Design a protein around this nucleic acid. Structure first.
Ligand SMILES: Nc1ccn([C@@H]2O[C@H](COP(=O)(O)OP(=O)(O)OP(=O)(O)O)[C@@H](O)[C@H]2O)c(=O)n1
Ligand SMILES: [Mg+2]
Length: 437
RNA sequence: GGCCCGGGGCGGUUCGAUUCCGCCCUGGGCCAU
């Protein structure tokens, strides 16, 4: 019931059990055998190699080290070739250079092509750094293996564990470095409560300092920011979880919260109680990977939100959801409808030249003077958020993401109310409005 | 692909645009393992 006791029970959630590790063992077993009966230089890395993987999150990563001279094409060609034979069920996967993911003796496995180097420099792509990481980190993270796990599980249970764009949280490598720096999961949590958006952590120098933005400098590359893809909001969300956990320890922070299934009528009653305008932009999901998709769903979500605010609808927040089939850009505005007339500022009264010009534009209402300057009554081309967004999406599709923008351009519709609550957006909507339960 | 910094063109809107909404070529960097 107290801090340490809680952590104890918590280990039984992050650390694996024999069966799973054994399975990981025999897995790594064949994988080498096959890899050897080909004879290709390979390095085992990642959480598996270092015994820092999360219970029920087994995944063996293997980096194929090629010479400096080789062609990146050789890297992927020769890389994929290898992945093929060595893997039970391969699958081409994409991101940096491409790579292959499959299964062996029952476990997930990654095979990534990268250039084997001497000295962190000569460094080409992010993968060429991985190998150094495992090196620097292997002689240090021992014995604390579980402090790392407790951390991941923590971040995980609370939705901020990934480093990819669909998370923008903490990479697994970031975690390890922290455990090395603070020495324990408890120590990190305690200290993170004082972290700021301007905190710099230099593990290589055992130092912490003030910088421009949150920065955890890489042991292996003083210039990289291990935590570079960690959104500020998530950073903050963590800092807070830490204060909270400390004030009241709980096993709960180590258990994923359940999706909270709410019935469409309760949602409808909430939206009505809010008297707000809640609607969604739906369009066929592009067929690109998540690291390409999400950043675009973000941009589009943002660009529309902005149109909404300069257009005076008063958006409150925005959200977005992606299913196998389509996408959804959610918005909730304070203005359901707005007047058609609005005022547009004009020149100062003494400026004759411009006054003339301003008054020559014939409009339906005849302008007036207020505090030494002219103003005119203009009419809006639309009066509801949905109305205006249909106009914007339809004519500004190109700026919502190379891919997202093109899907919308070929089709999109605006869903609202009775029909909206049916779409698979309930959870995102509840979340977006802070609905609680 | 997204993001940050810089050029060269244009369009729309506006009394007035380098200054808003956008589009084209283009230089630099960062992220995602
Ligand atoms: N944003 C990232 C992602 C990955 N890596 C490198 O890739 C390794 C992580 O690979 P991944 O399989 O994505 O995660 P793991 O570290 O193995 O941990 P977990 O599998 O539990 O996610 C890190 O150790 C690091 O060398 C990195 O440096 N930065
Ligand atoms: Mg892994």
């Amino acid at each position: 019931m107290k801090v340490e006791e809680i952590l104890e029970k918590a280990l039984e959630l992050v650390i694996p059990d024999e069966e799973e590790v054994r399975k990981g063992r025999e897995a790594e077993e064949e994988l080498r055998r096959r890899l050897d009966e080909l004879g290709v230089e390979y390095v085992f890395v990642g959480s598996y190699a270092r015994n820092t993987w999360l219970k029920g999150s087994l995944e063996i990563d293997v980096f194929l080290l090629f010479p400096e001279e080789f062609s990146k094409e050789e890297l992927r060609e020769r890389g994929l070739e290898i992945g093929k034979a060595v893997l039970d069920s391969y699958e081409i996967r994409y991101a940096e250079h491409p790579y292959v993911h499959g299964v062996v003796k029952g476990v997930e496995v990654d095979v990534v092509p990268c250039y084997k180097l001497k000295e962190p420099k000569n460094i080409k792509s992010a993968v060429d750094r991985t190998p150094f990481h495992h090196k620097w980190l292997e002689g240090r993270i021992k014995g604390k293996e579980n402090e790392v796990r407790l951390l991941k599980g923590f971040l995980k249970a609370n939705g901020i564990y990934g480093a990819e764009y669909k998370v923008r949280g903490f990479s697994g490598y970031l975690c390890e470095l922290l455990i090395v720096f603070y020495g324990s999961f408890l120590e990190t949590v305690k200290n993170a409560r004082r972290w700021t958006r301007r905190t710099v952590i230099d593990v290589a120098k055992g130092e912490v300092r003030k910088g421009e933005e949150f920065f955890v400098v890489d042991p292996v590359d003083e210039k990289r920011n291990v935590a570079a893809n960690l959104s500020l909001d998530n950073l903050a969300r963590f800092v807070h979880l830490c204060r909270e956990f400390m004030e009241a320890p709980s096993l709960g922070f180590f258990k994923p919260k359940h999706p909270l299934e709410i019935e469409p009528e309760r949602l409808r009653k909430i939206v009505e109680e809010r008297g707000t305008a809640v609607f969604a932009v739906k369009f066929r999901k592009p067929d690109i990977v998540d690291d390409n998709l999400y950043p675009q769903l973000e941009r589009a979500s943002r660009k529309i939100f902005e149109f909404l605010e300069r257009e005076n609808f008063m958006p409150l927040r925005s959200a977005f959801k992606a299913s196998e089939e389509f996408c959804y850009l959610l918005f909730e505005c304070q203005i359901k409808e707005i007047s058609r007339v609005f005022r547009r500022m004009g020149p100062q009264f003494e400026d004759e030249r411009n006054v003339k010009k301003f008054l020559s534009r014939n409009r339906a209402f005849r302008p007036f003077i207020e505090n030494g300057r002219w103003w005119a009554f203009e009419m809006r081309k639309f009066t509801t958020p949905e109305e205006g967004v249909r106009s914007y999406a339809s004519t500004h599709w190109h700026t919502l993401g190379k891919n997202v923008g093109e899907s919308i351009r070929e089709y999109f519709e605006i869903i609202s109310g009775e029909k909206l609550f049916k779409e698979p957006v309930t959870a995102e909507l509840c979340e977006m409005m802070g609905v609680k339960d």
